[PDB]
Design brief:
heterodimer, A: alpha+beta, Immunoglobulin-like, 5-stranded mixed sheet, 3 helices, 9 strands, 30% strand, flat, B: alpha+beta, 7-stranded mixed sheet, 2 helices, 11 strands, binds the ligand O=C(N[C@@H](CCCC[n+]1ccc(CO)c(O)c1)C(=O)O)OCc1ccccc1
């Protein structure tokens, strides 16, 4: 009987400065010290963000907080910033196999509009500009590997002679 | 602590996937060390761990197709998945759970995106000469470059509002 972790909502869009709270609910009780949270931006590996329900990994800004116990846990951003746009996973490290939640993708509401964009600081703007490169590189790389897939049976038929 | 992955990116069905994690900041004789894959639909699957002493755990979901292997001397450990169908397409991660965090995962390899290619084109590619096939093989290049250019231009537009907003 594996411990299913369910994350609501699966996606949520928020405007900067808002306070956002995403949740994780287990199928059975898990002690608080084994519930954890990870953040993943595209193109890079998950980062441990919060361990044991209420401890911030190093480098995790103080606007992040988390609480819960039993079968309901939650992660909260106080005053969201552009860079908190990511996918957040809960995970229990209690019963093997050590299952993850389905994720919550946190997007910037109305972020792709010059109307809203010019009210950002110059810093949040240029950090956001560069945050586009990993996304683009993942898409290109997914294409390159699709064509290594297409190149394969041709190379297998050229040498089947 | 740096977990470094290496291995092939493609594997044909019913073949064996093999991956290597080269730990460089701890010793695989200390604590635990796992493998985890992320399916394209943003779903993580814990595959298994190798322990400090050499005991292992394998996810029942994988049946017995998985064997995790360590090499205590080179501070490496290895994943091997047998009879790899296309449902094994995912990004494969090694990672270190840490006892101080009650085995929260604080270090992750950079991942390996592994595709499984059916490649069932015997019946089609038989009516091709090898010369036709080498034209067909080169036909993919302008096709792929087109897709890549669509990607590049999509982000040319997606960033334009940002650059406009900086100038102001
Ligand atoms: O000595 C003790 N052993 C434990 C298991 C050790 C931890 C196994 N484990 C847990 C979590 C993760 C990833 O979240 C992982 O890769 C491996 C027990 O009693 O089984 O205590």
């Amino acid at each position: 009987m594996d411990i299913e972790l369910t994350q609501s909502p699966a996606i949520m869009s928020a405007s900067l400065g808002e306070q956002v709270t995403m949740t994780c609910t287990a199928s059975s009780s898990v002690s608080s010290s084994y519930l954890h949270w990870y953040q993943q931006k595209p193109g890079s590996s998950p980062k441990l963000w919060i361990y044991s329900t209420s401890n911030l990994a190093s480098g995790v800004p103080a606007r992040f907080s988390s609480s819960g116990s039993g079968t309901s846990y939650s992660l909260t951003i106080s005053r969201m910033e552009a860079e908190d746009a990511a996918t957040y996973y809960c995970q229990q490290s209690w019963k093997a196999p050590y299952t993850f939640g389905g994720g919550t993708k946190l997007e910037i509401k109305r972020g792709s509009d010059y109307e809203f964009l010019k009210s950002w600081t110059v810093e949040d703007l240029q950090k956001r500009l560069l945050a586009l490169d990993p996304m683009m590189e993942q898409e290109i790389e997914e294409i390159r590997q699709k064509y290594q897939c297409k190149r394969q049976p041709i190379l297998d038929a050229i040498e089947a002679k | 602590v740096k977990l470094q992955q290496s291995g092939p990116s493609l594997v044909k069905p019913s073949q064996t996937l093999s991956l290597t994690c080269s730990v460089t900041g701890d010793s695989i004789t200390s604590g635990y060390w796992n493998w985890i894959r992320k399916f394209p639909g943003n779903k993580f699957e814990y595959l298994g761990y190798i322990s400090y002493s050499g005991r292992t755990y394998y996810n029942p979901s994988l049946k017995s197709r998985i064997s995790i292997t360590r090499d205590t001397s080179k501070n490496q450990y290895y994943l091997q998945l047998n009879s790899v169908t296309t449902e094994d397409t995912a990004t494969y991660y090694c990672s270190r759970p840490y006892y101080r965090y009650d085995y929260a995962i604080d270090y992750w390899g950079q991942g390996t995106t592994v595709t499984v290619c059916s490649g069932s084109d015997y019946e089609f590619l038989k009516s091709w000469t090898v010369e036709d096939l080498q034209k067909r093989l080169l036909a993919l290049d302008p096709m792929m470059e087109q897709e890549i250019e669509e990607i590049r231009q999509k982000y040319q537009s997606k960033r334009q509002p940002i650059l406009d907003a900086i100038e102001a």
